[PDB]
Design a protein around this ligand. Structure first.
Ligand code: ALF
Ligand SMILES: [Mg+2]
Length: 218
């Protein structure tokens, strides 16, 4: 049986993306840039803070110095951190808590494998810290998804090889990272986005221990 589960955060454990959207919308309102809506935000998902800012500036074909860029980036960050103070246990996606309980009950290690700079804070606000054996620090990895580094680090951090692990991800780049780590990916979303050659569930309520076991056994 697999010895660990390696969890992406956004789109697996919770909708962290929604808070990034509101922070971006709020900054854009403050500086008078139109068009930062839910559909434009589709183009910010899995994008770095700085690239996301640039795409926002591009809505107004606006030109700013390196200092101004840094300062807008800083304000969005301030915004986001202020907004996530309201994260609570009700933000945890369906089925995830139950899965973490069942994993812990079966002594299966649990690690976070997220790019989020606020991972530990977010898990604590969702009351999930006690389930996590480790959080891979994205500041300590050389390369981001789709490179497997974060997953490798998460597995190592709980004292297993990636090959003893299942990885859960909602992104195509995250799926690649899990494959290239050696661990077994199970996506959530649609095969159109994630690939056709891996097991995929439609939503997190389908991530059960029994299902993970079946997939590992198959
Ligand atoms: F939390 Al993620 F890719 F959604 F690291
Ligand atoms: Mg994600």
């Amino acid at each position: 049986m697999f010895k660990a589960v390696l969890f992406d955060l956004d789109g697996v454990i919770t909708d962290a993306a929604e808070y990034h959207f509101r922070a971006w919308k709020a900054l854009a309102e403050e500086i008078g840039i139109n068009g930062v809506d839910r559909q434009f935000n589709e183009q910010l998902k899995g994008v770095s803070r700085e690239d996301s800012l640039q795409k926002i500036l591009d809505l107004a074909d606006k030109k700013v110095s390196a200092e101004e860029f840094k300062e807008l980036a800083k304000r969005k960050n301030d915004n986001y951190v202020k907004m996530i103070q309201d994260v609570s246990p009700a933000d945890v996606y369906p089925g995830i808590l139950q899965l973490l309980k069942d994993l812990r009950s079966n002594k299966i290690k649990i690690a976070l494998a997220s790019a989020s700079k606020n991972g530990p804070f977010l898990l604590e606000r969702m009351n999930l810290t006690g389930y996590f054996d480790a959080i891979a620090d994205p500041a300590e990895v050389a390369a981001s998804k789709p490179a497997p580094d974060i997953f490798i680090a998460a597995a190592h951090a709980v004292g297993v090889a990636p090959s003893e692990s299942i990885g859960l991800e909602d992104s195509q780049a995250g799926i690649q990272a899990i494959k290239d780590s050696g661990a077994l990916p199970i996506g959530v979303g649609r095969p159109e986005d994630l690939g056709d050659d891996i097991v995929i569930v439609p939503d997190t309520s389908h991530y059960t221990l029994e299902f993970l076991k079946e997939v590992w056994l198959q």
